[PDB]
Amino acid sequence: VNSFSGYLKLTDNVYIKNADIVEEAKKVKPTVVVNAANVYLKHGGGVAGALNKATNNAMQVESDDYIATNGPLKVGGSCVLSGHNLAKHCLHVVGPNVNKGEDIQLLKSAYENFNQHEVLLAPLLSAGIFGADPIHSLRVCVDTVRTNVYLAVFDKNLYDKLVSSFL
Length: 167
Ligand SMILES: O[C@@]1(CNc2ncnc3[nH]ccc23)CCCOC1
Hints:
This is Papain-like protease nsp3. May form homohexamers. Interacts with N protein. The chain is an alpha/beta fold. The chain has helices spanning about 20-30, 45-55, 60-70, 105-110, 135-145, 155-165, and strands at about 10, 15-20, 30-35, 80, 90-95, 120, 150-155. The protein has one domain: Leucine Aminopeptidase, subunit E, domain 1 (3-Layer(aba) Sandwich). The two termini are about 25 Å apart. The structure holds the ligand O[C@@]1(CNc2ncnc3[nH]ccc23)CCCOC1.
C-alpha cells in the first residue's frame, strides 16, 4: 500500500491520473519523481522547467554541478539526483526529443531506467514539448516498465484521450 490517490489502474503496475506532477509530488513526497530531462540537464521548460521552478532553482544548481563533473547524459539515459522539496530522489530521464530529430526507438531505453526503482511518480516520456505521440509513449511505458509507475498527465483533454484509447 502507498499514498498515491485517485489514479485509474491501467495494468498490474501502471496507474494514471490527470494531475500536475509538481502538485502531486508536493503532496505525496514520493521516493522517486521522474523528470523529463534533456542531456544537458537544462531545465528550461516543460515538466523539467516546472519541477525546477518548484525547487526555487536548486534542481538546476545541483544539475549544473553534475554536468560539470560528468558531462552530458545519453539520450535514453538517466541519473539519480536529489528530489529537493518534491521527493526523496529525482530520476532525470532523457527521452528522445522528436523536435530535435532524435530516434523515437530510444524511448524504450528511456523507460527501462524506471525498472531500477520499485515505485515512481512520472510523466509520459517524450510527450509534451519533446514532440512524440503521448498515446505511443503510454504504450511503450506499459510494455517496458515492470515496476510500479504512477503517471501524471497535466492536460485533462489528453488524459481523457489516453484512457479512452488504451488497449
Ligand atoms: O506537456 C505534457 C507534459 N508535461 C507535464 N506533465 C505533467 N505534469 C506537468 N507539470 C508541468 C508540466 C507537466 C503535458 C501533460 C501530457 O503530456 C505532455
